[model samples]
Target: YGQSGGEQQSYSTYGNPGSQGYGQASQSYSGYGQTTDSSYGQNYSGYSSYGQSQSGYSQSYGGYENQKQSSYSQQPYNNQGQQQNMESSGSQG
Candidate 1:
């Protein structure tokens, strides 16, 4: 009776706790790995864009060129508009 009871106690103590510990550990470890891999993938892609984007300046240059061209055209147009408005106001007065 004593031997049977001891064996039952050992099995319940070690068996249940051992399996539970391993199961919970594996579950948390897998989650950590999954999150880290996703974060690393995003960082890798962002770094690639920053480094290679400058090397392939067509896209970057095109962006700046279009902006500068628009600004340059608008600068003169705005000056002409204000000049005409000023002259008309002066004449009316």
Candidate 2:
């Protein structure tokens, strides 16, 4: 106890808050893996021949005679998130 009239407790084998645990967390992520020309670039094939696409899913550009895509994709990766480790005991007063 801080002084006397108080009830002082204690912990056995563990961290009350700042404890390091083993294992990863759920946290997940994703993306195109590897690369091979998956990007947009300037086209020298004359005019913007982007023609037209079946507009859908987020984005789409028609006129393509000026800029072309390189299909540049990056490798996918993930780092499972996590919490703290296990503790033994705790006390209170």
Candidate 3:
């Protein structure tokens, strides 16, 4: 349960930031104008462009996360069948 389900938590949050700030902000910023202005190009353009690019470009959560979830679902089919153990014994050697 733990191992197979662990992958889902991270992918879930990646989706929110994509829809919330990353997509909305980038669209608002670039849609108007001034992306090429030296000041903005150096400041907002450099960082936000990279983060925003992942959200809309269909890459971060779109492509990679999409594929990652594919593996998470499929991994249990193969890996979940194996043996796992937890021991509470405390030992010193």
Candidate 4:
């Protein structure tokens, strides 16, 4: 929190001399990741006063998070040495 109101003796209900003033306010806190960001630009002053102000900031979390995999295989049996002959197949009723 902060303000640049400068100063005033028993400041009246409002700006009296210029009857107009300038000010600002801000707040920040963190319990989780500072993942969301927000900001704004503004201006203020009296009948003939003009000023400019702004606020901008951001923070986050990140990492490499890479991944990988492996595998193994085997061949069938008697596949390289098989030639036997046999005939059998008939749906009997």
Candidate 5:
């Protein structure tokens, strides 16, 4: 048989208006899992807000929009060859 591998990376940046006509924002990530032998990897990102407010309205807003995308691969194995190899090798050896 063969081998299989996959990777997913993403990034996001956002800005918003502040109470005093200023703006603030931040970025973050999650789901960062890695493996070398017969494993998988994943990555994620997020955003936050900061800064002071001078206006009556809050710096944070509602009704925001978001979009996402993902991809993966699935592999199959052959049992005949594997079984033959295991039998030939034997459990003791």
Candidate 6:
């Protein structure tokens, strides 16, 4: 046995984990088309009309946002005429 004694201590460390969750959601359209438009070429008095139609149409979205991502980034349509149709169709007209 000895008259004096010594003590020692040890410690452990932990890392800060990153947090993850759902983020903002978004939607976009890649392309658009007119499935049916009476005004596009409606026959009137045996004459064919040629113009934009405000009738039945179908709009579609190409890209949808994921739950994990911040938001959905969809490709934009380059065609002006198709874009106009999509807006005018009320997204389902």
Estimated TM-score per prediction? Answer: 0.15, 0.17, 0.14, 0.15, 0.14, 0.14
TM-score ranking from best candidate downward? 2, 4, 1, 3, 5, 6
lDDT of candidate 4 over 1-93, digit per residue (tens):
754433434332422243354576344455665444544334354333223435443444454332323345354233223354435542344
In the order shown, the candidates' Cα RMSDs to the true structure are 32.4, 26.1, 14.8, 33.8, 21.4, 32.1
Superposed model 4: Cα runs more than 4 Å off: 1-51, 68-93
Candidate 1, residues 5-91, lDDT tens digits: the string is 111111223121211322221212335433432322223112234322445323222222221344336444322112212222222
The candidate with the higher lDDT, 1 or 6, is 6
lDDT of 5: 0.39
Q: Stretches of candidate 3 above 4 Å error?
A: 1-56, 60-82, 88-93
Would you list the C-alpha lDDT of every candidate in the order shown?
A: 0.27, 0.42, 0.37, 0.40, 0.39, 0.39
Cα lDDT for residue 79, candidate 3: 30
Model 3: lDDT equals 0.37
For residue 62, model 6's alpha carbon misses the true position, in angstroms, by 1.2
Residue-by-residue lDDT tens digits, candidate 6, 1-93: 544334444433333323323455344457696656444332322233356534553444455433333457576444322221222322231
Clashes of each: 0, 21, 0, 1, 0, 0
Candidate 1 shows a clash count of: 0
What C-alpha lDDT does candidate 6 achieve relative to the native structure? Answer: 0.39
Q: Total backbone clashes of model 4?
A: 1
RMSD of 1: 32.4
Q: Compute the lDDT for candidate 4.
A: 0.40
Give lDDT tens digits, candidate 3, residues 1-93: 322322212222434343333332332354666545243333333234532344434534334333234433644422313354546544444
State model 1's lDDT.
Answer: 0.27
Error at 11, model 5, angstroms = 9.1
The positional error of residue 85 in candidate 3, measured at the CA in angstroms, is 1.3
TM-score of 3: 0.14
Give lDDT tens digits, candidate 2, residues 1-93.
Answer: 354443445434422323344445453338767645454334433223333434433333454332333577466444444455545445555
lDDT sort, best first: 2, 4, 6, 5, 3, 1
